[PDB]
Amino acid sequence: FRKMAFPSGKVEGCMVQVTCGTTTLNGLWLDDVVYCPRHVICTSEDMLNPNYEDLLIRKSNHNFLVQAGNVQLRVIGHSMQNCVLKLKVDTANPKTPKYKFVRIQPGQTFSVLACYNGSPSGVYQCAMRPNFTIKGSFLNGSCGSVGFNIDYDCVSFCYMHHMVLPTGVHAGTDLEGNFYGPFVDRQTAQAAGTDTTITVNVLAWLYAAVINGDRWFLNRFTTTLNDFNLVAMKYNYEPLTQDHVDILGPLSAQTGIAVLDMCASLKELLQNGMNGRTILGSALLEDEFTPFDVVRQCS
Amino acid sequence: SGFRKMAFPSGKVEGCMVQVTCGTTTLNGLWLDDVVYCPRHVICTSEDMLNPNYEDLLIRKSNHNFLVQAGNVQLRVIGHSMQNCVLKLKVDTANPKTPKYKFVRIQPGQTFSVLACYNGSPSGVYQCAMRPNFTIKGSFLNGSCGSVGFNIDYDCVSFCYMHHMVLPTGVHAGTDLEGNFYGPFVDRQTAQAAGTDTTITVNVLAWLYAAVINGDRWFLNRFTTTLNDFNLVAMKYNYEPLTQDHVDILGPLSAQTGIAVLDMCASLKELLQNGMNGRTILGSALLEDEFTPFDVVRQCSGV
Numbered sequence: 001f002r003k004m005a006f007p008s009g010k011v012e013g014c015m016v017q018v019t020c021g022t023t024t025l026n027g028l029w030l031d032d033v034v035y036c037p038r039h040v041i042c043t044s045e046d047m048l049n050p051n052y053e054d055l056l057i058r059k060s061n062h063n064f065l066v067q068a069g070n071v072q073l074r075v076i077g078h079s080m081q082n083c084v085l086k087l088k089v090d091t092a093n094p095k096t097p098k099y100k101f102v103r104i105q106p107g108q109t110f111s112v113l114a115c116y117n118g119s120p121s122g123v124y125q126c127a128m129r130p131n132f133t134i135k136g137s138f139l140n141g142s143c144g145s146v147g148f149n150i151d152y153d154c155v156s157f158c159y160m161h162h163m164v165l166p167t168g169v170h171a172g173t174d175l176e177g178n179f180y181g182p183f184v185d186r187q188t189a190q191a192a193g194t195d196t197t198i199t200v201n202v203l204a205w206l207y208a209a210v211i212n213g214d215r216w217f218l219n220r221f222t223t224t225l226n227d228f229n230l231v232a233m234k235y236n237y238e239p240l241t242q243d244h245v246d247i248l249g250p251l252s253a254q255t256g257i258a259v260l261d262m263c264a265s266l267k268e269l270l271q272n273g274m275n276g277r278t279i280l281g282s283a284l285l286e287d288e289f290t291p292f293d294v295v296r297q298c299s
Numbered sequence: 300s301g302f303r304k305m306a307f308p309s310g311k312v313e314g315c316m317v318q319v320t321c322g323t324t325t326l327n328g329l330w331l332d333d334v335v336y337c338p339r340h341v342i343c344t345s346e347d348m349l350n351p352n353y354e355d356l357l358i359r360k361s362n363h364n365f366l367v368q369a370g371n372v373q374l375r376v377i378g379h380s381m382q383n384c385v386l387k388l389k390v391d392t393a394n395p396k397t398p399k400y401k402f403v404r405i406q407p408g409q410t411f412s413v414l415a416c417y418n419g420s421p422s423g424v425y426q427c428a429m430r431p432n433f434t435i436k437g438s439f440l441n442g443s444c445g446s447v448g449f450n451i452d453y454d455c456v457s458f459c460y461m462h463h464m465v466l467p468t469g470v471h472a473g474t475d476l477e478g479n480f481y482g483p484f485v486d487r488q489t490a491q492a493a494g495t496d497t498t499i500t501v502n503v504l505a506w507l508y509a510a511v512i513n514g515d516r517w518f519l520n521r522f523t524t525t526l527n528d529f530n531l532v533a534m535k536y537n538y539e540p541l542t543q544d545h546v547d548i549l550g551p552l553s554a555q556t557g558i559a560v561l562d563m564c565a566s567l568k569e570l571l572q573n574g575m576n577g578r579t580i581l582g583s584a585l586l587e588d589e590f591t592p593f594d595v596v597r598q599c600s601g602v
């Protein structure tokens with residue numbers, strides 16, 4: 001098993017750069033709107049303690065430089081929505097894919113198209129942690145890079161990059177500008193809460209192991225969802241929700257192993273350990289593959 | 300900040316993928332200018348693939364025997380030749396989205412991005428390394444043949460891999476875009492083993508430097524080693540020898556971190572002899588060898 005990103009071309013065709021003063025970052029051009037982090041309006045000193053409503057009052061359309069490559073797109077309107085700026089431009093992007101804006105849950109994965117100066121640089125798969133950070137790879141100039149999933153022909157954008165934390169993980173918003181987690185867009189060191197293991201994804205991984213004939217860990221027991229959640233929390237594992245149980249449905253049907261029987265197997269692995277054994281060639285339980293990723297790599 | 304297995308953006312390649320069908324055999328092709336490149340075993344029937352005389356099988360085909368679909372459009376084949384294990388279909392239409400490109404044959408230990416495709420449709424993109432035994436640890440399913448591997452520099456796509464085969468061990472084998480396999484493999488329907496799969500030492504060292512740049516030094520030690528004494532231990536553990544060129548190529552990472560290359564060699568020697576003792580590096584419980592020094596430099600320079 002490996003991390004696989006979605007093909008990035010539909011998103012590449014939407015990346016632009018946005019500059020205000022000497023402050024430059026990336027934006028997302030869909031139809032005639034460009035979406036970007038609102039701190040582009042800040043000088044470096046402004047970002048220490050910004051009052052964004054007051055800073056924006058001092059800006060007009062003609063203070064925003066939007067470029068597709070080196071080609072300028074004239075800005076004809078602007079507004080703030082939470083921590084994102086929306087710049088209306090006078091050109092509808094001919095490369096706009098079918099798209100939606102979605103807000104994901106911890107545990108869900110997405111592809112990040114890391115960009116610099118409006119130019120796509122690399123693509124990789126990330127998982128939203130329970131503490132609402134991602135382990136990205138981002139350098140200066142990466143803000144406004146986006147994360148997304150592709151379903152059929154539709155790009156679902158879920159993430160726009162804003163922040164690195166002192167621990168070197170990343171934080172950002174959805175495309176309506178609402179941060180994931182307790183973070184704010186300020187030039188300040190902010191701590192993320194203690195993280196936990198993504199249980200639903202570990203279960204998906206165990207189903208993947210079974211699909212491939214690696215099933216020594218299957219035990220004879222079952223559990224209730226409540227009892228499992230209480231045990232899991234003592235091992236720093238997330239509780240399962242009903243949605244988690246439901247998204248495990250297809251893998252449960254494919255293998256014939258009920259979700260709560262697999263939970264009882266995992267409980268035993270937590271309580272008793274691996275006994276120097278491996279699962280899918282690994283002593284670590286992997287928690288960054290969703291049930292969809294498992295299906296997507298097995299078929 | 301951070302270090303992740305990263306692929307190049309795939310859009311320039313997506314615009315070149317098409318579907319090639321001959322008989323009941325369908326796989327992917329690569330459409331550049333007015334030529335479509337694909338694995339020649341498309342011309343094969345199920346019975347042919349056991350021992351295909353490709354020159355014999357190809358001469359019996361006509362241009363119209365090849366159905367090339369690009370999205371909803373069918374491209375008319377107006378010529379066809381064979382270059383080793385790659386078929387070259389001349390089409391009457393030049394692909395308008397052809398990027399600047401070159402064909403290159405990659406060296407073992409180098410990385411490239413793979414755009415996995417099915418029925419001419421891009422499905423996923425990931426980074427691989429060409430292993431010392433000339434296999435790649437890919438993710439490919441039925442119908443993935445003709446998927447390509449590439450690197451991008453500025454605006455130029457260097458195609459280096461086209462996919463053909465899975466081995467019994469689950470690793471993968473393919474050719475360059477001149478149709479020559481990497482490794483001792485053959486495009487016939489047989490179970491093939493690779494040579495011994497050694498570890499790309501210069502890459503493990505780069506990844507250790509990446510781990511240091513990202514704040515983890517638990518594996519470092521106060522010891523050093525000579526290059527030869529390191530290589531003696533490395534070869535004992537089925538690692539490739541480190542050459543002076545590798546040492547030099549690691550210079551920028553050594554400069555950035557302040558850790559002499561042979562001091563990092565002494566760290567790796569200790570990891571090989573003692574193991575990792577349940578600890579992890581950059582989240583991995585194994586020594587990773589599929590990032591090149593340049594992969595690390597481009598993600599971690601300045602951090």
Ligand SMILES: *[C@@](O)(CO)[C@H](C[C@@H]1CCNC1=O)NC(=O)[C@H](CC(C)C)NC(=O)c1cc2c(OC)cccc2[nH]1
Nearest residue numbers: 047138139140141142143162163164185186187188189
């Ligand atoms: C965007 O490029 C800014 O436009 C930038 C992305 C980071 C640069 C290096 N890697 C990244 O992911 N974001 C920032 O520089 C933000 C700007 C905010 C939104 C105004 N700043 C931080 O992420 C930042 C500031 C501080 C800090 O201060 C003090 C102390 C510790 C961490 C930290 N992160």
Ligand SMILES: *[C@@](O)(CO)[C@H](C[C@@H]1CCNC1=O)NC(=O)[C@H](CC(C)C)NC(=O)c1cc2c(OC)cccc2[nH]1
Nearest residue numbers: 348439440441442443444463464465486487488489490
């Ligand atoms: C191509 O899509 C075929 O067009 C296909 C890709 C593999 C399918 C499963 N995963 C893959 O990477 N390649 C093949 O099916 C090739 C066809 C050759 C080039 C004629 N064959 C193999 O991959 C192959 C055959 C055998 C085998 O036999 C008998 C025994 C064991 C492994 C094996 N692989």
